[PDB]
Nucleic acid binder design. Structure first.
Ligand SMILES: Nc1ncnc2c1ncn2[C@@H]1O[C@H](COP(=O)(O)OP(=O)(O)O)[C@@H](O)[C@H]1O
Ligand SMILES: Nc1ncnc2c1ncn2[C@@H]1O[C@H](COP(=O)(O)OP(=O)(O)O)[C@@H](O)[C@H]1O
Ligand SMILES: [Mg+2]
Ligand SMILES: [Mg+2]
Lengths: 654, 652
DNA sequence: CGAGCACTGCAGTGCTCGTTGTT
DNA sequence: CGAGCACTGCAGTGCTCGTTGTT
């Protein structure tokens, strides 16, 4: 309450932002200048000084990590006493709005979210069903196309081709794709955002209701917003809502998904009386780390520059280690962390960052061999594991037979006599009759259109699903899950998967029961099954979340934006890894990789360590990458090359 | 003794039996005692001419006819037959090749290749020669090859298509001789060549067998004739008996000209004709005569009898095959109920497939019966498989046995794997087991395959030695179990799986019994091939006799029933499609009718199912050829329909 | 009616080629 | 380098098509 406790630590610019009149404001500043601090305290100020209701506040951002950071700080300052307040990601809040107004959004209340793997599989099926050649029209490319369209709020009709074969056909795939999804009750990530926006365009009363409620909007890491997210925010505010956005154009790293830097300027041009407050003092890092970050970003052109200075001492130098290979690299990092831990440092204060999720495997193996606890975020996590996807598909079918993605994944898993031929018929019937896979089956059976054994095998499957639905129709989430895993036969085929592969695999199925068991959700209303499935999709990059045990934090450079750690290790500092080969294979996606390097460097509070491997094996071949150009861009006085302690063993003559 | 031998004979039979040693032909109609003469002649040669039993060879074509000679010889001379050779051409030829395999150029335990096996191999062979199966039917090759051997012709021979078959024939021989396989025709030809190439061997037999007697001479084809002619040379004395009106093997080389050939070639050859019939009633005999008279080129013959007319020939029109079968069982039941023996009843048919519905009706009526010919016990799938494992144990080169059980039970050796081994043998000029031995040794087969194939070769070797020191049946039972066949047939769909498991049991019991120039197992195997038609050894039990009209030639029964007397069955469609097929079929009907001693019964169905489809045949023309006073149709209604006077109407 | 064929499901296998991040 | 398949091989199953007689 006491305004006094809200402003004490804040400096000149921070106070100006926090204690400002209600109005559209942009807080623009480099990393670690306290923008998120300003955002959280602003919320506290709006509630105590401007007496705004918690219910009129919306705090939003793109990534789960940054949203969690906002939420955590909001809890510590105002206490968990923040009911009525919406804090989450654009996808999360969109999902929320959609569940609450599914009818107006033209969606079934229990719609299922389609993740990337599911979306790619559906597309691989649709394309083949359209007779299109595989290697000719990649489903991956179709996915990029479709998602890019949705990133720009464009539906199949909004766009027309002018001959352009590739364009006109991708257009057909997109039409069929949308048809299959709506018909199956499926919603992909991009659909959540677009549908949510369309909701307020088609339902003026619904929008009015929200414009009346959310009069205070706050967006963190604004430069992450793409066009559909920007539009959504603009709409919600109208000419009555007061918005505070904080961000840094030097940390723009989502150009590949529609987030353009112009968005910051657009806010200044579009929102009523919008103004700018620039923060200039960094509190996160040592001068050594900050000086390196500054020299690095300076290498990008086209930027009105920013101050960013600190009071802190130079601190330790930035370590640079040239590893023998990727294995030595991982072992070195673990060795360094052990030392930190042996001297009283928490493992959770250590982050290991990398450009691509594929780099975590070797790090993981080194951590495991050292019996050092760790948590990995992003990439192939728990809910994306084969056995877990299989288990959830049965539950998904129980919730909705029309779930074509679920149907395809387990209709014949474990094998039950329903081979490719039979399924090809089913898919053909869905294609021609414009029906869901389960729908098509119902007919092909009530028309004796299939062979004897076929229809019989297919009939049994449908009976097994209908059975599971009734049997567990009342069971609590976790027991229904235990049941399904056993009765589906999945538990059986996995036990006898042979090797240590099947063992860990059966454990994951056990861990899933626990997850559904310990699952906690609250505040409108959604059944446990749906709420769990949507959580597994929206916060998949999270996986299982034991968060109290001290453990090393592993994640991409992207997922780390917004976070900070006393010790930071950035591995794979080599041309072809970071910058990524794709950014190299292009001429200037380099400034964005450099902005990502800037993000990486500014995560370190006390110590930053950079590593690169003379050689590593990629795709069956040994490669000798050049050292990343970002290393040389740092000031030599801030960097200290690591020279392994000289030794000597027992003399061996001959 | 002498007296007994002549007491019952008529003038002509006596003349034949008590004649000096010389080449003689006894030509006479059915049932005139030709076989009686042949048998008594043997006794005469031993008592009066004091010829040694070791100098006598009595041979004929079919197992039934040979068994008939064997039986009468035994009833006339008992045990005074030791050293005497009595059997079939294939049988005696087989005994010779065993006793002189080295000189015949055959392994000690060569395996006889029956019809099924021969055809299968020819299918595998033709495909390997990249020949189009539909362009070169394996059935054609079989007909070609055997027909070639019926004449004693080797793959040499002297046309476009002619040269191809000639080649198929060549590969076939090489394949067989390599695997150590001998087909039925190979037995006759090889036996004959054995005398053409081994003078000292021929001399030994000409010195031993100075007395040759052949029954049913008109069954001899060209290779069998040569064989006999050669054995007799210019020193051996021969008696051949037969009747050209009973020539029914034209389809396998047997020609009427052979009887005349005998009179031309054999030194001092003379003919003696018998005329009196002692088998049948006058009714049956006159129907037979009217029947045979419809064939042209006949010189007459026509035998008679002193016997009374006896019962007429019953004619029954059945409503379908099943009714035909049940009607016959009904008639036989009455015969039995009046003290008649079942074995005095024979049910004859044109083709073996007709026995099935008959067997079904007999089983349903719990009437004991015994079938000869066609798909017999040793022809059964399960029995064949079990005997194939036994064959590979006696010779891994047995390609027929190999490819039959290599993947039965299924053991991972699929068709793809086998196709490789096949082209391997085809080009490497070796057997299948030899191709597998190599390919495996010189690692050329995938890990999955190679591990299964050898796994099989290992199994056989195990079985081979594991049972080399035990009894036949013990060895059989063992091989049936360890081969997996037992387990396989036990799970086999309960649609017939049981009976098959029961047949395998019978196989053991059969091997358990069974009755010395060869090992027990090789004797059993060869018997199953040469006498396959006999099926399982018969008990003493009284039972109805079922067999084709062909197999019945030489036999006689108080009661004879001939079923399927329908156009399309007898004579069949195929008999109206070629030269003198129809007349040969009529000769077969003459043979059928003349088997009957007291009563003959002819039946035909208004409808029957052939290859599944329902047909409606007209009664056989042979029925209409019989004199109406010899036949009495079986009434299907009791009253005589009242004549229907014409009603003068203009309505449609 | 009964022996081979055509089909379909399933397991074991070399062969190809993507190849950056987040929801 | 390894997921994803395209292939290949083996089997179980439902349906098509036709052959005298003997050793
Ligand atoms: N005025 C201040 N006094 C002391 N610490 C501060 C102040 N402002 C921010 N911080 C601390 O500095 C660190 C980085 O600031 P942060 O909010 O995360 O920066 P930004 O969001 O701009 O990247 C945090 O540990 C934060 O708690
Ligand atoms: N002279 C005879 N007196 C009495 N019965 C005879 C006489 N000759 C033959 N038989 C009997 O007549 C029947 C038929 O004679 P069989 O030798 O079989 O004729 P074929 O061989 O000429 O067809 C037999 O039952 C036979 O034992
Ligand atoms: Mg921040
Ligand atoms: Mg006779």
């Amino acid at each position: 309450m006491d305004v006094s406790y809200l402003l004490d630590s804040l400096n000149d610019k921070q106070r100006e932002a926090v204690a400002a009149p209600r109005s559209n404001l942009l807080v623009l500043a480099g990393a670690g200048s306290g923008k998120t601090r300003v955002l959280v305290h602003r919320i506290a100020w709006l509630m105590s000084v401007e007496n705004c209701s918690p219910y009129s506040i919306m705090a939003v951002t793109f990534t789960n990590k940054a949203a969690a950071e906002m939420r955590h700080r909001i809890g510590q300052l105002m206490g968990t006493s923040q009911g009525g307040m919406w804090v989450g990601t654009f996808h999360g809040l969109a999902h929320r709005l959609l569940r609450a107004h599914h009818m107006d959004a033209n969606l079934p209340q229990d719609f299922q979210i389609l993740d990337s793997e599911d979306q790619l599989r559906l597309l691989k099926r649709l394309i083949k069903a359209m007779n299109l050649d595989e290697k000719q029209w990649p489903p991956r490319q179709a996915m990029w196309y479709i998602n890019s369209q949705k990133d720009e709020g464009l539906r199949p009709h909004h766009i027309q081709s002018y001959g352009n074969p590739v364009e006109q056909t991708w257009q057909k795939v997109y039409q069929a794709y949308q048809e299959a999804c709506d018909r199956a009750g499926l919603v992909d990530f991009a659909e959540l955002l677009l549908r949510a926006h369309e909701l307020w365009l088609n339902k003026p009363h619904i929008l009015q209701h929200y414009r009346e409620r959310f009069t205070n909007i706050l967006v963190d890491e604004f430069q992450d917003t793409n066009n559909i997210q920007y539009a959504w925010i603009r709409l919600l505010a109208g000419d009555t809502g007061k918005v505070m956005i904080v961000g840094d154009d030097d940390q723009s790293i989502y150009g590949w998904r529609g987030a353009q830097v112009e968005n910051i300027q657009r806010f200044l041009n579009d929102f009523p009386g919008a103004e700018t407050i620039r923060l200039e003092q960094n509190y996160r890092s040592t001068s050594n780390i900050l000086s390196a970050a500054n020299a690095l970003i300076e290498n990008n052109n086209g930027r009105l520059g920013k101050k960013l200075w600190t009071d802190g001492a130079d601190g330790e130098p930035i370590s640079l280690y040239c590893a023998f290979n990727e294995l030595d690299e991982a072992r070195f990092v673990v060795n360094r962390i052990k030392t930190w831990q042996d001297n009283g440092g928490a493992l959770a204060e250590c982050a290991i960052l990398y450009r691509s999720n594929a780099q975590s495997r070797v790090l993981e193996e080194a951590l495991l061999q050292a019996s050092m606890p760790y948590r990995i975020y992003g990439g192939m996590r728990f809910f994306e594991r084969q056995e877990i996807k299989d288990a959830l598909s049965y539950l998904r079918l129980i919730v909705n037979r029309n779930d074509d993605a679920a149907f395809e994944r387990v209709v014949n898993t474990p094998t039950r006599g329903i081979g490719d031929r039979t399924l090809d018929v089913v898919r053909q019937t869905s294609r021609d009759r414009q029906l869901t896979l389960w729908q098509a089956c119902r007919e092909l059976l009530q028309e004796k259109a299939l062979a004897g054994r076929a229809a019989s095998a297919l009939q049994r499957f449908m009976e097994l699903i209908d059975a599971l639905a009734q049997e567990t129709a009342d069971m609590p989430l976790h027991v229904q899950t235990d049941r399904v895993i056993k009765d589906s036969g999945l538990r059986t085929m996995y036990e006898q998967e042979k090797g240590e592969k099947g063992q860990t695999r059966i454990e994951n199925l056990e861990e899933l029961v626990t997850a559904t068991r310990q699952f906690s959700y609250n505040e409108e209303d959604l059944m446990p099954l749906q709420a769990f499935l949507s959580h597994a999709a929206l916060e998949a990059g999270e996986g299982q979340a034991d968060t109290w045990q001290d453990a090393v934090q592993l994640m991409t450079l992207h997922s780390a934006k917004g976070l900070e750690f006393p010790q930071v290790f950035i591995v794979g500092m080599e041309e072809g890894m970071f910058p990524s080969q794709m950014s190299l294979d292009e001429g200037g996606r380099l400034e964005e990789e450099r902005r990502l390097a800037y993000v990486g460097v500014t995560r370190a509070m006390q110590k930053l360590t950079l590593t690169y491997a003379e050689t590593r094996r990629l795709y069956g071949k040994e490669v000798y990458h050049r050292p990343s150009r970002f290393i040389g861009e740092l000031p030599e006085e801030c960097v200290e090359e690591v020279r392994l302690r000289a030794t000597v063993s027992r003399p061996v003559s001959h």
